[PDB]
Amino acid sequence: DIQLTQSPSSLSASVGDRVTITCRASQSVDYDGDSYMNWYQQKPGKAPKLLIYAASYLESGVPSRFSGSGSGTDFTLTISSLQPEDFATYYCQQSHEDPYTFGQGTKVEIKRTVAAPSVFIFPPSDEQLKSGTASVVCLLNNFYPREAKVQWKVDNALQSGNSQESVTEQDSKDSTYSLSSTLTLSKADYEKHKVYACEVTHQGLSSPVTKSFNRGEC
Amino acid sequence: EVQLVESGGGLVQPGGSLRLSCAVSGYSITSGYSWNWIRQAPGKGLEWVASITYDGSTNYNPSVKGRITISRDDSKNTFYLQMNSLRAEDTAVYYCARGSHYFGHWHFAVWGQGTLVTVSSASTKGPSVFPLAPSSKSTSGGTAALGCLVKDYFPEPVTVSWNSGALTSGVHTFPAVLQSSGLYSLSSVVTVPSSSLGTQTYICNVNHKPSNTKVDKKV
């Protein structure tokens, strides 16, 4: 009533490669020969954008690389040649019966060549230190693939349970990711130590990379 | 030329009520075949909840059966969403959207930007903004990173631009993380030429509407 199931839930593909995504309805969405399945593209922080309506019609202003086919209960969205600007979550949506329903979404990433992170490190500001806390920030810029390991070390003690990280979505400019790790400590603990290091392991690095600084140059 | 702009997002007490509005521009609400609300829980997933047809007929998703009211004001060129008895399950980005006169009607080619609604007992808290200053240790190649740390706010979201939106190239604004405190923290960085650190001014503009907090931090 009426359940749509997409597959895969996530996929990754080389630029230019053909991509096909499936939608399966629990009941038919056929009506007067027409099939009432729709496809949307949702880029991060954006409202869904309509690509296909009535199973096979291209919405005005959408590139011809996107096409839909199918009928009854089996439907297919295809992207003839995956472009970088195509990273997004794709949804199917039936418009045959109220409670109009969407698929669970398919996540689509462009698989590019390996690119090693550029690492940067930031000491806490004096402005924050006066507040009684110290956040240390590590930036991993423009890398691929998404997976990356970040280890925090303070005077060579491995910090654990002490930090949090966030990863940007894929950048269409160059198909990379970026990542921010923030190490949080009390001012007291921060003032009691000297060496603050951010160690990074990534597929694009033959060996780990460490960016560090000494309090007293922070 | 047709834009949907929404208001009424923010913090709501569990059991309370929300009142969203979609202000239509470049188009008469009366010409629309259908106007709709569709929400998306942060987790992910879209859910249609309500519609009003040009004749005034209203329709609701039973998933929220009897705690919703879609309505419109033609003289204001606006339509509204009201819900009450709000649960945490109701936390979501809420989108308005226009339906079509063609091909079965119930597909949406025009959407608003969305507004986040957070249902929580916690209270609003504005962020602190601290510098992420450039350094030799943030200058790997002939290019430097600097940024802003937007720390300890509630609830989402926070808006971050650089130099009043004049600087977009090289800018990365990261997803907020939820701290063990229950507060959010977020960083924004920009990679720039290290040779301009002495001559160019870099200001991150931070907005947190829920607490009515705006900050401009030079780094």
Numbering used by the authors:
A (entry chain L): 1 to 218
B (entry chain H): 1 to 219
Give the published text.
Omalizumab has been approved for treating not only patients with severe, persistent allergic asthma, but also patients with recalcitrant, antihistamine-resistant chronic idiopathic urticaria. Such a therapeutic anti-IgE averts the anaphylactic effects exhibited by an ordinary anti-IgE because by binding to soluble IgE, omalizumab blocks the interaction between IgE and its receptors, depleting both free and receptor-bound IgE. Furthermore, omalizumab forms small immune complexes with IgE11, whose fragment antigen-binding (Fab) regions remain free to bind allergens; thus these immune complexes serve as “antigen-sweepers12”.
The 2.42-Å crystal structure of the omalizumab-Fab region shows a highly negatively charged surface (which shows the surface electrostatic potentials from the APBS program for the six CDRs). The L1, L2, and L3 CDRs exhibit negative surface potentials, whereas the heavy chain CDR loops are neutral. The neutral state of H3:His100c is consistent with its low solvent-accessible surface area (SASA) of 3% in the crystal structure. Although H3:His100a (SASA = 15%) and H3:His97 (SASA = 31%) are partially solvent exposed, they are hydrogen-bonded to each other and well-packed with vdW contacts to nearby hydrophobic residues including H3:His100c. The H3, L1, and L3 loops contain residues implicated in direct/indirect binding to IgE from site-directed mutagenesis studies, namely, H3:His97, H3:His100c, L1:Asp30, L3:Glu93, and L3:Asp94. The predicted IgE-Fc/omalizumab-Fab structure is consistent with the following experimental data:The docked IgE-Fc/omalizumab-Fab structure shows that L3:Glu93, whose mutation along with L3:Asp94 to Ala reduced binding to IgE26, forms a salt bridge with Arg457 in the Cε3 domain. The L1:Asp30 side-chain points towards the protein interior in the X-ray structure and is hydrogen-bonded to L1:Ser31, while its backbone is in vdW contact with L1:Tyr27D and L1:Asp28, which binds IgE via hydrogen bonds with Ser471 and Arg470, respectively.
